Amino acid sequence: PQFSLWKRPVVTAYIEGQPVEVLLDTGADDSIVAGIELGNNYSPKIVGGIGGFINTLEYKNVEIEVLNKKVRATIMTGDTPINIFGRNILTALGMSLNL
Amino acid sequence: PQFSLWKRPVVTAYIEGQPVEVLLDTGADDSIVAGIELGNNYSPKIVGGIGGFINTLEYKNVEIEVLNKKVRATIMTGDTPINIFGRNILTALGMSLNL
Numbered sequence A, B: 001p002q003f004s005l006w007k008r009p010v011v012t013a014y015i016e017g018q019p020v021e022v023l024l025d026t027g028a029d030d031s032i033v034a035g036i037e038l039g040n041n042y043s044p045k046i047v048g049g050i051g052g053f054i055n056t057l058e059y060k061n062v063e064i065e066v067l068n069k070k071v072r073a074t075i076m077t078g079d080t081p082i083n084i085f086g087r088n089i090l091t092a093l094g095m096s097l098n099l
């Protein structure tokens, strides 16, 4: 699939059985999903963007299915207005930006 | 041509003469830059993201040349740590995210 940028490129993902809507963001190093339950093997981290810095919960190799394709990749939880899917998953899926 | 997400998709643009390193971001509704003196032709505004809000000077019809294409578009000025090229500029050059 092609992606028009006329609308926000929001697609729906299943984060390990848990369905969730995420934004394909090529200006994110990482992926931040709010309120999903991923467990116990976490490490707190802080992320940054334009208003400042947020505190997160880093989980590794979680399983993810999006655009009907599979992946295991780092997942950071936090207080984000939207679930962002950054470059770490975009590469995993083989996504690109074309002019 | 084409771009991978291995590395930040950062490009060299020229906003009315002045060259700058910009991030191609499908996750921004708007474009924001710093260290560029546009003029006393603006409207002020509050754009938000991770970490909260920031204030900007909004400037309509600015001319840009990036990746061999010339376009005219709104550009916001403010305290962004990295210059940003949002969806307003992506659709002006005919870029898309594909899989």
Ligand SMILES: CC[C@H](C)[C@H](NC(=O)[C@H](C(C)C)[C@@H](O)[C@H](O)[C@H](CC1CCCCC1)NC(=O)[C@H](Cc1c[nH]c[nH+]1)NC(=O)COc1cccc2ccccc12)C(=O)NCc1ccccn1
Pocket (backbone or CB within 6 Å): A023, A025, A027, A028, A029, A030, A047, A048, A049, A050, A080, A081, A082, A083, A084, A086, B025, B027, B028, B029, B030, B031, B047, B048, B049, B050, B081, B082, B084, B086
């Ligand atoms: C750390 C991971 C994280 C994803 C991070 N990057 C960013 O946040 C990107 C850059 C500033 C670097 C940023 O453009 C990004 O993609 C974010 C992510 C955003 C989170 C909120 C939900 C929607 C998406 N986009 C943005 O910040 C753009 C900026 C903008 C332009 N016009 C108006 N606003 N925001 C938007 O388009 C408006 O989004 C919103 C959508 C829905 C609700 C919202 C509620 C409140 C605020 C925003 C909402 C990064 O890698 N940063 C590297 C870095 C940071 C600091 C210092 C050095 N390096």
